[PDB]
A paper describes a structure:
All four monomers are folded almost identically. The TTPA molecule consists of 192 amino acid residues; in the electron density map, however, all of the chains have an additional nine expression-plasmid-derived amino acids at the N-terminus (numbered −8 to 0). In chain A, most of the C-terminal part (except for residues 181–184) is visible and forms a well-defined α-helix. The solvent water molecules were classified on the basis of electron density and B factors into 885 fully occupied and 10 half-occupied sites. The structure was refined at a resolution of 1.9 Å to an R factor of 18.3% and an R free of 22.8% in an isotropic mode. However, the TTPA molecule has an additional domain consisting of two antiparallel β-sheets and loops, which lacks in gp11 and gp4. Moreover, the crystallized TTPA molecules adopt a tetrameric structure in which the helical domains are directed toward one another to generate the hydrophobic core, while the loop/β-sheet regions are directed to the outside; thus, there is relatively limited contact between monomers. Our Phyre2 server analysis (confidence 67.3% and identity 21%) showed that the antiparallel β-sheet region (residues 57–99) of TTPA may contain a lectin-like domain; as such domains interact with oligosaccharides, this finding suggests that TTPA could display glucanase activity.
The KP32 bacteriophage belongs to the Caudovirales family and can infect multidrug resistant K. pneumoniae isolates. Analysis of the KP32 genome revealed the presence of three tail proteins that are predicted to be involved in the bacterial infection machinery: tail tubular protein A (TTPA), tail tubular protein B (TTPB), and tail fiber protein (TFP). Interestingly, although TTPA is considered a structural protein, it also possesses the depolymerase activity described in this paper.
Residue numbers in the entry:
A (entry chain A): -8 to 180, 185 to 189, 191 to 192
B (entry chain D): -8 to 71, 74 to 179
C (entry chain C): -8 to 176
D (entry chain B): -8 to 175
The structure:
């Protein structure tokens, strides 16, 4: 097939990665706001840690769901269960491009006939959520800055932090749009056709 | 998702926090009308200290009781034993028009009870201290109280004009905040 | 006490008022993005008019459904069909507070006994939808400005319109929030 | 809702709008490259005009066919001809979402059932091509700039034009990507 993301995350079950990379990002958000870093997230005393984690996760998902070159599995072949005919829509999946295949209850559902059972494999273009050490630097900068900005604004309101972050976010956001101009916006309009 | 307030204050029993952050805000009110700061709020004498503290508390409650992103818990769970659930001093409001406070206890008015089969998940507004809210809100609250304290007891004109400008600026910033974060509904 | 909303709209059968007030509010959204006003909302079949009207309706219902001093009736008594014993939950009703009565059909369904059907006898806190000339000016301005901003953003994307409308919405919200704090608690 | 595109274009006969908005966009491509504007798009004569118009149409179709909040009708109802059962797949139609219905030879074709004839109306999610004055400003700027760059690159090769157009495209794309994330 085609190019894949750095992380496949096939066994992700929770909303969060629970990783060193996620901790580092949350610790950056805390720092921005004047709070000292923690050694684990998991574990679950403070409101500020929990809130930063949540804000970060939502922004991460919102930006990644658009779909970009680094988080796209260009030609993913999905094979149904032999007995049930089912294909799980796994928790790390953000979207199947095209408007035909959607998540219904944790299962890939085909709108062309109205079914979640398949007699053979399907090949689709899939967006898979990546962790912060699995994306280009410009994306980690845009997501973690945007999250820091929101965390500041919602709970703290330090204006020097806001002015500073607004500028860093603008710059990362321009860099991510320059990326997309180089790599292209995937459109479903196999790998060869994916021409756009 | 769900985000919580920075302060939970479950063991708050009085009307006041009694914190350093409270003292700093009262001291700003006193400075605004030319009185000197105090090192504690534990009843000192001083009618001006007491009055500032009370005006500040009332304005704080009034503003915070509207419900804002920073003091709303969208999924707070309250477990009742005796069936009963206390409505604590830090609770301002449970949104939605079903549960309310009956002399210190949560009253479920879908059934007219205040005893509960299990536990409940509600949307709850909880009073935050001055170091637990965004700067714009502290500014609005503290400036509004300062102005009220001036007008009620002193009436200095240059204070009034100055505070009025600051209150208006804070109030715009708080309305911008809510446009960014949204008003909760249901 | 008991004060009532200015509009009860019992005969309202579809989603829209169809009123002169609605027409004015739509013409205002049209003026904001540079289009000409219309003389009626009974189109054919201008897309812009249909879209403005839907967006405006949705925002109106959304903001009003919170419940405010101007659109709550703390003791609305509703009376059944008798025969069927059935109480409609009408287009103009946004919600019944308290947690017991809810919209099944709509009807009206007592979620604490059965039961779609009633002997008489029912008194209730009702939030009812007001028309654009039946609310305080600040709420009309909020609803219309917010609707105008969604209409712009989705279909037009004019940056100066957005900036200007955003400061108008903020002004309206500042007045509605004073209203909410003044009448509430 | 319930919301519909600004333009339905049910009577478009060919690939092009023929409109003042189309003319103005082609004139902008001509200006980017140092050529004078024209008063109309079919005379013809002009190779540059014909090529700019084709490039612009192709880019316009390609970007729009993704489907956006401004050009999706979530419940378009299409009604078959009574005698024939057929439903034309019109030139302004870009796609029908879901994987069931496609354009086969100019007719709406249900590829799941394996039929292009229908006993009554169908209601579908239709993406319909908008004119340059019927889309949000950031999309017109994206499409016209992109088209300008392809026209330059293929026939002119002016490097200063490419550098300046590439900045303006990036700026437009940034606004269109905020739109996509805001309306997604």
């Amino acid at each position: 097939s085609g190019l894949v993301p750095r992380g496949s995350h096939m066994n992700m079950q929770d909303a969060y990665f629970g990783s060193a990379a996620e901790l580092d990002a949350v610790n950056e958000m805390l720092a921005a706001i004047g709070e000292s870093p923690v050694t684990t997230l998991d574990e679950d005393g403070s409101a500020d840690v929990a809130n930063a984690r949540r804000i970060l996760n939502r922004i991460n998902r919102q930006i990644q769901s658009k779909g970009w070159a680094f988080n796209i599995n260009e030609s993913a072949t999905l094979t149904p269960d032999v007995s049930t005919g089912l294909i799980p829509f796994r928790p790390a999946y953000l979207s199947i491009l095209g408007g035909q295949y959607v998540n219904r209850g944790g299962w890939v559902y085909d709108k062309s006939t109205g079914t979640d059972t398949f007699s053979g494999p399907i090949t689709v273009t899939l967006i898979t959520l990546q962790d912060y050490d699995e994306m280009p630097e410009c994306f980690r900068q845009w997501i973690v800055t945007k999250a820091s900005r929101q965390f500041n604004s919602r709970f703290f309101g330090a204006e020097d932090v806001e002015n500073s972050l607004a500028q860093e976010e603008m710059e990362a956001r321009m860099a991510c749009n320059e990326y997309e101009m180089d790599f292209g916006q995937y459109n479903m309009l196999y790998v060869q056709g994916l021409g756009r």
